[PDB]
Design a protein around this nucleic acid. Structure first.
Ligand code: ZN
Ligand code: ZN
Ligand code: ZN
Ligand code: ZN
Ligand code: ZN
Ligand code: ZN
Lengths: 102, 296, 186, 296, 187
RNA sequence: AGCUGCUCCCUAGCAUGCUACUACCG
RNA sequence: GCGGUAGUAGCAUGCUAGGGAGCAG
């Protein structure tokens, strides 16, 4: 199954609370919205796969900008404790293959 | 979430026993919290035990066990004391300059405003500590005076004459021109505007500001503000430049202002000339003469 | 985490057993290092664990505190961020009519009602001085929002009619100046 | 969930064998529950065994095994005695002051109201214990009286004259003006309003409150209340202040109030002036002349 | 956990082992005072591990009955709220119009839809536009539901008072236009 | 300001299960 | 040399509880 791309992009741009207009405070919203958008990668229309790729790139940017705050405003060195799985396609491909993990 | 008073470092902690709720660096706060009578710290959340029904609010006993901050008598094993290394746990746990000599701040903090020395030390320190001391001094002023006598005048003697009653258990302030009260008109629910008046010898005579006719039931206190922190120093940094900056040279003047012109230049070429005045030397005449000398 | 006390003890035991296996004399005199040593790993891995996850617990508490602080300080500044955003966006739109009305409003000429779109319907505009009257009104035709409106009536700040040819240079200091033009769209 | 009677500390334990069910803190409860004939304690849940068919309800023996409270013959291995350290298990286990000399409360609790000495100790102690003794006394009063002979008059002799039958196994209480009954009218289901009346020598003559005509089927009791806890002491703390507080000076008085003026002042100048009165000295006149002295 | 009965026992076992270590005599020195120590193993295992379970269970119980006390207080609070509300709405109700219609019913029961229709003292009308205003409540008195009503106050969608002269066919486009009329039952 | 269903992330706990080190007895 | 039990540490799977978020009717 795959959704209408406008629905996912609109869930990206318009929100119902002002706190959700800063990405580094949640990030999980975009992980979930990227789970919903994975099967567009197999579409013949090229402007449909770009939605999934845009979401992965944005997640990586948000993680980097959140971690580069605790090293300057404070002096906290965050370690990438396997948070690099969220901006790679395997974590999302695993959700549509028959061998559960619910 | 702003810079400390003694450190210019953004912190998030607040002295719990203080009155102005100031911003303190973790090590700097450690100094102040173990070196005075300030026993509590507030962060984005209050560091208080979530064990239901506890009241010990010192600093050093408290322990953090995750998304909660306990007592040792309230403690699960997996934790870390909130107090260690001479540094209370908080945001900015690295980049706080602190200060080894804070007994100036400390003295201001336990200054109860009774001796002259409290004023002297308030008047001898540097800028932001001075603002802190001044605003705590007003706060203690409003704590002092409003908690004194309510003026529940319960009958009228004659024209500008009154009979006095006032609160039991707490004494009553003097009734002078230095102590201005403020009225409230009580009805079946609450109070209404009356205004600020004075009391004097009667049997009480009131030298009220304007006309008013009050029967029994009313009572008076001296109202105050809830003073916020300020923004600026007592005086600006001085100047020794060349220019009477920003103004327009003079063409006309009166010969009574002969002694005025020589002093107009000095207030003009440098940042400030501190005005000293014996009683009645024309300072006001001088003070209106500045615009007479510079009409722009 | 190596700056811990029992590190010295564990290193001592392991070096001693390295010597014992490099000498290879006995089986239980070498088991000495092991009765002696398994104690080292029962007091170094028992203390190189709790602080290792405490290091992460602390970082996750401080990230949570930072997020709550930022969240609460974002919603105390809504009605300054919103207006700054709106004006950057309006600048980068770069429309002629919007720029016209925004520049006019910046120098003083504002409307009094919503700008009508029908070729009928009325528009009222406040004009505060002669100079801004020169640029827009010449003749009986008004230029506003990149359009043309035909003047119908001018009244003063005294709420009384002023005829149109009266407004000129010399008589400008004679009228309480915030007039109100009334025009219909062409 | 409030202050205990002897310690002013928040607890949750109540003597089960008492009549008032009073609050008793942990050590204070231990004292009373070992030192008297009160063998039961209730908390937010009653400390009783949960094995079906148990009725031994002492205090020391019970054992707590998690989400239950057992007796030693009812006990799975994971447990702890509910009574240890001389301190029963309940909320706020730490911050209870307790009391060592609680034999006064112990005697009040065991006071069965027979001897004069019961009344002597009940009138020699301190304040909230005064209240506890008073309410226990009145509760025991109504346990006393209601459970005696039923006033079942089973025929009418003549005008204001009746024939009496009374309860068997329980004797019948006096029939005097000091002992006022209360009427209930039986219908095929239940009782209806009759009112309070008195019995005297007949063969029973009744000194009725008002006219009534009762046939057979009727019977009487002396009804009572269900006395709840009180709030306040027997008197207010005294005063020795300077003012006739809260009232208005006098212009008019009748000279028959000559002996009245001298004692008006003392009652109002200080908290309370307790009045003793010989029979017919003018006390009520004085108690009416109070408002005569100050119409306000 | 140091005041237990076995802290002294393991202390004296290790103290005697220390005494013999300062001595260091025989093989039984090792065997014994590693087995004086190896007996005081169960002490400080069970007496310091069953003492590590009773305390957790005690804390569980105390927290649980704290919860129950709070839940028991909130119940009384909401009980009082409901009672006050019922008895408050009771005192706008017990009129004689109500008893008059109730006693005319043959068995005691009436429909609920006819109680405000026949006993209410005040009426509220909500008007969408002026054409509806002309046909419903023009004038200063009108008749609805078999009775006569008398207007007091008119407000608009902003809760601002309108005067009856303003409501006209050519002033209509200047009003916020649901209007709300309030009237009183005429006698 | 509702009723349902599914999915991701974080912490706590319980028992279970696997696995490693020490001690005691057989 | 092995088994059994008793302790201590690390690891997984499952269940429960609590909190945060996303989609669908
Ligand atoms: Zn402080
Ligand atoms: Zn500081
Ligand atoms: Zn605590
Ligand atoms: Zn007590
Ligand atoms: Zn009792
Ligand atoms: Zn039992």
């Amino acid at each position: 199954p795959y959704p209408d791309p406008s629905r996912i992009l609109g869930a990206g741009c318009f929100v119902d609370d002002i706190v959700k207009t800063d990405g580094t405070l949640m990030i999980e919203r975009f992980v979930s919205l990227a789970i919903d958008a994975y099967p567009l990668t197999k579409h013949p229309n090229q402007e449909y796969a770009d939605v999934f790729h845009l979401y992965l790139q944005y997640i990586r940017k948000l993680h980097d900008e959140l971690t580069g705050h605790m090293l300057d405003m404070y002096s906290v060195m965050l370690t990438n404790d396997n948070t690099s799985r969220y901006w790679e396609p395997e974590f999302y491909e695993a959700m549509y293959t028959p061998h559960t993990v619910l | 979430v702003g810079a400390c008073v003694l450190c210019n470092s953004q912190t998030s902690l607040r002295c719990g026993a203080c009155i102005r709720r100031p911003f303190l660096c973790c090590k700097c706060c450690y100094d102040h919290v173990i070196s005075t009578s300030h026993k509590l710290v507030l962060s984005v959340n209050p560091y208080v035990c979530n064990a239901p029904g506890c009241d010990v609010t010192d600093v050093t006993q408290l322990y953090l066990g995750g998304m909660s901050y306990y007592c040792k008598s309230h403690k699960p094993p997996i934790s870390f004391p909130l107090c260690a290394n001479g540094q209370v746990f908080g945001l900015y746990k690295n980049t706080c300059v602190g200060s080894d000599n804070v007994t100036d701040f400390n003295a201001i903090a336990t200054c109860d405003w009774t001796n002259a020395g409290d004023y002297i030390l308030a008047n001898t320190c540097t800028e932001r500590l001075k603002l802190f001391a001044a605003e705590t001094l007003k706060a203690t002023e409003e704590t002092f005076k409003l908690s004194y006598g309510i003026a529940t005048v319960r009958e009228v003697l004659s024209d500008r004459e009154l009979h006095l009653s006032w609160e039991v258990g707490k004494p009553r302030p003097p009734l002078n021109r230095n102590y201005v009260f403020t009225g409230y008109r009580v009805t079946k629910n609450s109070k209404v505007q009356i205004g600020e008046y004075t009391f004097e010898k009667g049997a009480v005579v009131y030298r009220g500001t304007t006309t008013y006719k009050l029967n029994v039931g009313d009572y008076f206190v001296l109202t105050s503000h809830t003073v916020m922190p300020l923004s600026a120093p007592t005086l600006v940094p001085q100047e020794h430049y060349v220019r009477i900056t920003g103004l327009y040279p003079t063409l006309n003047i009166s010969d009574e202002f002969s002694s005025n012109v020589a002093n107009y230049q000095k207030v003009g070429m440098q940042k400030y000339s501190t005005l000293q005045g014996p009683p009645g030397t024309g300072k006001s005449h001088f003070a209106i003469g500045l615009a007479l000398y510079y009409p722009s | 985490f190596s700056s811990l006390p029992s590190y010295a003890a564990f290193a001592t035991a392991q070096e001693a057993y390295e010597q014992a296996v490099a000498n290879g004399d006995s089986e239980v005199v070498l088991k000495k290092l092991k009765k002696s040593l398994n104690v080292a790993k029962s007091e170094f891995d028992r203390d190189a664990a709790m602080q290792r996850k405490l290091e992460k617990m602390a970082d996750q508490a401080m990230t949570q505190m930072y997020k709550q602080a930022r969240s609460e300080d974002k919603r105390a500044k809504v009605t300054s961020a919103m207006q700054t955003m709106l004006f950057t966006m309006l600048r980068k739109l770069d429309n002629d009519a919007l720029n016209n009305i925004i520049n006019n409003a910046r120098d003083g000429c504002v409307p009094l009602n919503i700008i009508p779109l029908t070729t009928a319907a009325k528009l009222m505009v406040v004009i505060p001085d002669y100079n801004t009257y020169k640029n827009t009104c010449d003749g009986t035709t008004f230029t506003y929002a990149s359009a043309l409106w035909e003047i119908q009536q001018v009244v003063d700040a005294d709420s009384k009619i002023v005829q149109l040819s009266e407004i000129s240079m010399d008589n400008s200091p004679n009228l309480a100046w915030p007039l109100i033009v009334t025009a219909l769209r062409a």
